[PDB]
Design a binder for this molecule. Structure first.
Ligand SMILES: [Mg+2]
Length: 564
């Protein structure tokens, strides 16, 4: 029935529904086995909306397809309706990529959106589930709002719900629900999952150029792996149906509730199938996305790996191959501090501002909203532009395809030319996982004290054959030029006179300990060095980093858990 009663349900608050910067993430079993866990959190989000503004408000709702998503969406509809939210816009089958949500919020001027995703984390009956809140600029809810949600969730005693309301998520169009003893209806609009996002890309890129690139016998041959996650139908409808790439181009492009039993996390080992396909030499270009579509990995012929720090620098260096930037101009470049300095070389040469921010969306969003930021990158497979207010993996792929079309060179030849022009920033990230937090903190504090001494700047480190000289050493701090906030203790930086850096970060302590992240950025300009093996060229600075930090002595680790 489309005539439904509003009911108040007494509930018991939980104490741990703290939404963080990427949403509340708990095991699926937690959501299923804890009474009113989901309901409490959804009500807490909706209670941040002024009652007077609810009727004219729209919330965009969708997710990455993982197990439990549709049940969660039904809960959101039932609770939003009962709370006087006038309208929901929901992707068909509940499916919306995180970039598509950002796109739709900004296009229709919604007050925000609720995204059902835990991004790269596994899904399924034994997997993870996540609930993310975005606000009216299409971006993540900032700390002041997530703080309020948390506060509400810890003392909630009741929520409002229409228990009999049920949305058909499979059929396009407007469904209206008349609420008992409420004058105005509740409206749900089911939209095609891809349409608005594709229409946005169709304006950003030259689809005629891309169709020519991707179709015919002389076509660029691509393999695009959605990793069984949300971007699948976007690949099929945009790259295959509209742009004419053959259907076999679309890899793992049917969304699965368990992401096929694997982590939808794009890197060389979680996307090993794509890497092996690329190794055969048949395809010119490959790419992988994470579960909600805001991260991307870029591959060339034979499985040549474009590391994400280089990827954003290449896009910057060929940015006017993309029609969007021909019209906006380039307002600025940015990277998170641990990302390699490759982008900086391009920005310096082209005389464009480079903003080096702490890790976190808010810093990019602030600069984009100031019209100071066109292109951003993170070493963790993140690339974006100010076209929306989330990173966007498929966008980054179409950027690469636009560049390939104008340059008429292989991926690898473009990188080789880039390194020859700008020098090469060899780059790796070492993750030491589940380390004992007390020894790891001791490592960091002892190293910070070493770096703070007056004599540390100017110290020399040898390989030997080569001398690295400390130019600067600190614990990174950032004063945000838009919101005035000061972010402190954002990472230990060893900055060397030759353009190289070592960066140490220590994560928060989880149930199994903390993660030490060690970033090595070694700059080389010599033609005899820029095409050598990266782990060989990085080995001297890796040795210096392990020696100065005494990491093995403090943690007992002789090797990182993961190398990227
Ligand atoms: Mg993601």
């Amino acid at each position: 029935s489309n005539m439904v009663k509003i009911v108040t349900v007494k509930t018991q608050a939980y104490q741990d529904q703290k939404p963080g910067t990427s949403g509340l993430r708990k095991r699926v079993k937690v959501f299923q086995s804890s009474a009113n866990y989901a309901e409490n959190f959804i009500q807490s989000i909706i209670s941040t909306v002024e009652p007077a503004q609810r009727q004219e408000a729209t919330l965009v709702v969708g997710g990455d397809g993982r197990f439990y998503m549709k049940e969660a969406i039904q809960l959101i509809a039932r609770i939003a309706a009962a709370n006087g939210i006038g309208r929901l816009v929901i992707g068909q089958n509940g499916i919306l990529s995180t970039p598509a949500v950002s796109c739709i919020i900004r296009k229709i001027k919604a007050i925000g959106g609720i995204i059902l995703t835990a991004s790269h984390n596994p899904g399924g009956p034994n997997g993870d589930f996540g609930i993310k809140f975005n606000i009216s600029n299409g971006g993540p809810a900032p700390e002041a709002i997530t703080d309020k949600i948390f506060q509400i969730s810890k003392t909630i005693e009741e929520y409002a719900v229409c228990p009999d309301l049920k949305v058909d998520l499979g059929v396009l169009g407007k469904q209206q629900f008349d609420l008992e003893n409420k004058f105005k209806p509740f409206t749900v609009e089911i939209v095609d999952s891809v349409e608005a996002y594709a229409t946005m890309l169709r304006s950003i890129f030259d689809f005629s150029a891309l169709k020519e690139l991707l179709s015919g016998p002389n076509r660029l041959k691509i393999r695009i792996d959605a990793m069984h996650g949300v971007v699948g139908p976007y690949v099929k409808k945009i790259l295959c149906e509209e742009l004419g790439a053959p259907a076999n181009s679309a890899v793992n492009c049917v969304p699965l509730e368990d992401f096929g039993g694997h982590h939808p996390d794009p890197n060389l080992t979680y996307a090993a199938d794509l890497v092996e396909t690329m190794k055969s030499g048949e395809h010119d270009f490959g790419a992988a996305f994470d579960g909600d579509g805001d991260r991307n990995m870029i591959l060339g012929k034979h499985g040549f790996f474009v590391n994400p720090s280089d990827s954003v620098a290449v896009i910057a260096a060929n940015i006017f191959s993309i029609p969007y930037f021909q019209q906006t101009g380039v307002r600025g470049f940015a990277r998170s501090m641990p990302t390699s300095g490759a982008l900086d070389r391009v920005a310096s040469a082209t005389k464009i501002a480079l903003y080096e921010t702490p890790t976190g969306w808010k810093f990019f969003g602030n600069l984009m909203d100031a019209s100071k930021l066109s292109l951003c990158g993170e070493e963790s497979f993140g690339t974006g532009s100010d076209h929306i207010r989330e990173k966007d993996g498929l966008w980054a792929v179409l950027a690469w395809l636009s560049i390939l079309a104008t340059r008429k060179q292989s991926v690898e030849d473009i990188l080789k030319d880039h390194w020859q022009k700008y020098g090469r920033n060899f780059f790796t990230r070492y993750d030491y996982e589940e380390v004992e937090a007390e020894g790891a903190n001791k490592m960091m504090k002892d190293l910070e004290a070493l770096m703070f001494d007056r004599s540390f700047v100017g110290k020399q480190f040898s390989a030997n054959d080569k001398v690295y000289t400390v130019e600067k050493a600190d614990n990174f701090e950032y004063s945000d030029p838009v919101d005035g906030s000061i972010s402190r203790n954002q990472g230990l930086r060893l900055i060397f006179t030759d353009g190289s850096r070592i960066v140490f970060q220590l994560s928060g302590t989880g149930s199994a300990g903390a993660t030490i992240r060690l970033y090595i950025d070694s700059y080389e300009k010599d033609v005899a060095k820029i095409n050598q093996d990266p782990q060989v060229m990085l080995a001297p600075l890796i040795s210096i980093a392990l020696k100065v930090s005494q990491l093995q002595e403090r943690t007992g680790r002789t090797a990182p858990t993961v190398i990227t």
